[PDB]
Amino acid sequence: ARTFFVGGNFKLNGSKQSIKEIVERLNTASIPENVEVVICPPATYLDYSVSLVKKPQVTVGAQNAYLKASGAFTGENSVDQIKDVGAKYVILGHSERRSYFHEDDKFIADKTKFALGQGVGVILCIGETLEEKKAGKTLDVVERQLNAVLEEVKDFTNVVVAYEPVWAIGTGLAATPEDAQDIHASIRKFLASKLGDKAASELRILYGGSANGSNAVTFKDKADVDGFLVGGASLKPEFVDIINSRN
Amino acid sequence: ARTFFVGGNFKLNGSKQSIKEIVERLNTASIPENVEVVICPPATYLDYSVSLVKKPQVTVGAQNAYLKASGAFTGENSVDQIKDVGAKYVILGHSERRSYFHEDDKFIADKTKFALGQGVGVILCIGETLEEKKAGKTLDVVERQLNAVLEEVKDFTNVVVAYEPVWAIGTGLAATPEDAQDIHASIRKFLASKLGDKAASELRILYGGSANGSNAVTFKDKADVDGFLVGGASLKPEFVDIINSRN
């Protein structure tokens, strides 16, 4: 079926020393056979992180990139450069980019198409705000965000979707496992209509937003929740407890 | 005296191999002792670049960073992390960030203050568009851009200013040495009124915008032009000719 996937988004955090400690912990940890773990450090530490990983279940991703591989884009990251240093994924559409950096739905779509065509997988983030949720707009919002991508991207084989309610990011206010499950089940049926039944059944749809070592186990029996995108807890020992939460 | 300064802004260009070739060419180049050369690769290559330098004249800079050192800012660079890997500068306010990425004058000011307080130097970019030049607004624009920074930043000891007319960036259409000289002198005079005579006398003011190995030598006798911020030519062997242009 679907291989359980745990992404660690370090965000703007880390030093050479602290990232070494996170990666050695993973190298020495009990990790199941059938799990995919992707750690996403700042771009400054991508090469170094790859160089430290020894565990086959662990790969490295970037936190953002531009929609061209080269050119006059001072300060951007490139998917070709991410690939050059051995990383395998990029996070696109994170709420912090859509909000604070005003990245619109088409910008995210164009970046996703570009990354996939360069042979780099995408952790595609979607999610609604608190106001949007209270007004009944959750599914309309995430379907709008996905539709923009689907106009440009016809094959999600090297995509993982992360559903992260904005109001749950960093706040300690996570969605309930039942509410997450219901939203993920709706997203998957929507995508079956766009990508086909097989692709929908293969696609990992992650929960993120205050996922931690204590609540991850509460999602264990939610069939349409295929893993997590973990922010703050990815810096901490309990990241390993999340990885093992389906034991 | 003001030490001649040559910055190389690689923009969104490079690979581990092609950056190694750039740095090794600098390492073995015949260059004067009293020059300051700062190469600015993509964030993905900062640590690697620092590790390869074997030339006292050469240090490394980043192309952009955020106004905080850590936190929930997916996809940003941090001045603390740039410093951690051995880099000494950050480019702030590049036209490609101000224009395409809508980085406002206040955002640049706040980043510049932050970087300097973390012990990282700043290559501060300013410049007018074609329409602004035609309208008679060149000095009004660069004084507005500088004034925003000066509200937050009271000491330019670890600053280098890069004057880059936007219409000259990447186009082949450089300012003339006479015109650059007159603008640089006007900027220095303005800044003496704000920062004092000592500071204005010590500040490097660079020209950028289609600075290349043929035209750099034509600026050799312009007293207020202290060096160059080089984009496209920083990827090429002629970068060394620019460093040697005052021989």
Side-chain angles (χ1 to χ4, degrees):
Chain A
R2 295 178 293 270
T3 296
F4 190 59
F5 183 108
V6 180
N9 179 10
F10 298 178
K11 308 187 185 184
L12 196 64
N13 295 280
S15 63
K16 291 194 77 169
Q17 181 54 48
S18 72
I19 292 179
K20 180 173 68 155
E21 169 176 345
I22 289 165
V23 178
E24 293 179 334
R25 178 169 37 237
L26 289 168
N27 285 341
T28 61
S30 151
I31 293 181
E33 182 153 29
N34 64 359
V35 177
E36 181 171 8
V37 177
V38 177
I39 53 170
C40 303
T44 302
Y45 302 118
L46 283 166
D47 182 331
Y48 181 60
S49 293
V50 172
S51 84
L52 297 177
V53 166
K54 298 304 180 153
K55 194 76 145 115
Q57 298 103 305
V58 179
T59 55
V60 178
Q63 289 175 25
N64 189 36
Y66 189 58
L67 49 63
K68 300 288 183 185
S70 70
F73 306 104
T74 298
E76 290 303 289
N77 309 315
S78 167
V79 294
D80 283 3
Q81 295 172 348
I82 293 161
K83 189 178 194 197
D84 183 47
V85 303
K88 303 290 190 177
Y89 281 94
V90 59
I91 305 175
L92 295 174
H94 195 274
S95 180
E96 294 153 8
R97 304 244 40 111
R98 295 179 181 267
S99 217
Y100 308 139
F101 296 100
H102 293 210
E103 300 198 11
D104 74 12
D105 295 345
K106 173 134 171 88
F107 197 43
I108 302 310
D110 288 343
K111 288 179 175 191
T112 298
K113 181 177 173 180
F114 188 71
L116 296 167
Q118 297 311 108
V120 172
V122 172
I123 302 164
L124 175 61
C125 298
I126 61 180
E128 86 293 351
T129 66
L130 184 61
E131 290 167 322
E132 284 162 350
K133 170 171 174 55
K134 292 177 179 163
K137 299 170 180 175
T138 302
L139 295 182
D140 291 337
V141 170
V142 297
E143 289 179 2
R144 173 193 82 221
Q145 295 174 328
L146 286 168
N147 276 146
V149 178
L150 294 160
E151 206 135 19
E152 294 303 324
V153 179
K154 309 305 180 175
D155 183 340
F156 276 35
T157 296
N158 200 199
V159 176
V160 169
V161 173
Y163 170 62
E164 313 190 286
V166 179
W167 49 268
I169 300 174
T171 53
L173 309 173
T176 70
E178 296 80 359
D179 286 347
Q181 165 62 30
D182 292 341
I183 294 156
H184 290 215
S186 294
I187 294 165
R188 196 182 302 282
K189 279 183 181 68
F190 165 79
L191 291 175
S193 78
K194 305 286 183 178
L195 297 171
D197 297 328
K198 178 179 177 285
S201 75
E202 293 177 353
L203 181 62
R204 284 75 65 78
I205 312 175
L206 320 177
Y207 171 74
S210 303
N212 61 55
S214 176
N215 68 12
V217 65
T218 72
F219 296 84
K220 169 185 170 148
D221 293 316
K222 304 308 182 183
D224 291 285
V225 178
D226 305 311
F228 302 98
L229 191 56
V230 185
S234 72
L235 303 177
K236 301 181 184 178
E238 70 190 86
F239 190 55
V240 172
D241 295 331
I242 298 175
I243 291 164
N244 283 129
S245 64
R246 305 278 169 100
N247 294 6
Chain B
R2 300 188 292 274
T3 296
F4 186 59
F5 183 111
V6 181
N9 179 6
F10 298 175
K11 308 187 178 185
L12 193 66
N13 299 281
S15 65
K16 289 189 77 165
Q17 187 153 286
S18 79
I19 292 171
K20 179 185 78 218
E21 294 182 25
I22 291 160
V23 177
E24 292 183 328
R25 175 173 41 244
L26 285 167
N27 283 347
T28 59
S30 297
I31 63 165
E33 288 187 9
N34 194 28
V35 68
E36 185 175 3
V37 181
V38 181
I39 54 167
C40 302
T44 298
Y45 303 116
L46 284 165
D47 181 340
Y48 185 57
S49 294
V50 169
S51 81
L52 293 175
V53 168
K54 296 198 223 70
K55 198 69 153 197
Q57 296 98 318
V58 179
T59 57
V60 180
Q63 291 177 23
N64 189 37
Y66 192 58
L67 47 63
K68 303 287 175 51
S70 67
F73 310 107
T74 298
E76 293 299 291
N77 310 315
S78 166
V79 295
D80 283 7
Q81 298 174 170
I82 294 158
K83 193 181 180 65
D84 181 49
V85 307
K88 299 292 190 175
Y89 285 91
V90 60
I91 304 175
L92 299 171
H94 195 273
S95 179
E96 295 150 10
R97 305 244 44 107
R98 296 182 181 264
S99 197
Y100 188 88
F101 292 103
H102 49 79
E103 295 198 12
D104 58 87
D105 293 353
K106 170 61 175 163
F107 195 42
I108 306 311
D110 289 341
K111 289 174 175 198
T112 296
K113 179 181 179 174
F114 189 72
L116 296 167
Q118 301 308 108
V120 176
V122 174
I123 300 166
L124 175 65
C125 302
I126 61 184
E128 89 288 353
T129 68
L130 183 61
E131 276 287 284
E132 289 162 347
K133 170 174 182 192
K134 287 192 279 30
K137 300 272 190 189
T138 299
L139 286 183
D140 286 349
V141 167
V142 298
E143 288 180 1
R144 177 183 28 79
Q145 293 175 326
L146 287 166
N147 277 149
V149 175
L150 293 163
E151 287 307 50
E152 292 293 344
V153 179
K154 309 302 182 179
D155 182 350
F156 276 31
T157 300
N158 200 197
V159 178
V160 172
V161 171
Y163 169 67
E164 312 190 285
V166 178
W167 50 267
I169 298 171
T171 53
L173 307 174
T176 66
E178 174 190 25
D179 289 345
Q181 167 58 31
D182 285 350
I183 292 159
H184 288 216
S186 293
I187 293 166
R188 194 182 308 279
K189 178 186 162 192
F190 170 77
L191 289 172
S193 74
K194 306 305 159 83
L195 295 170
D197 293 343
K198 174 187 187 287
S201 76
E202 292 175 345
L203 180 65
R204 280 76 63 80
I205 313 176
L206 318 179
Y207 172 75
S210 303
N212 61 57
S214 295
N215 61 9
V217 69
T218 68
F219 298 77
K220 68 190 289 175
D221 293 322
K222 299 307 188 180
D224 293 281
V225 177
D226 306 315
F228 300 98
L229 188 56
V230 186
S234 72
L235 301 176
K236 301 174 180 187
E238 75 192 68
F239 187 58
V240 173
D241 301 332
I242 300 171
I243 296 160
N244 288 139
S245 66
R246 308 245 167 131
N247 288 7

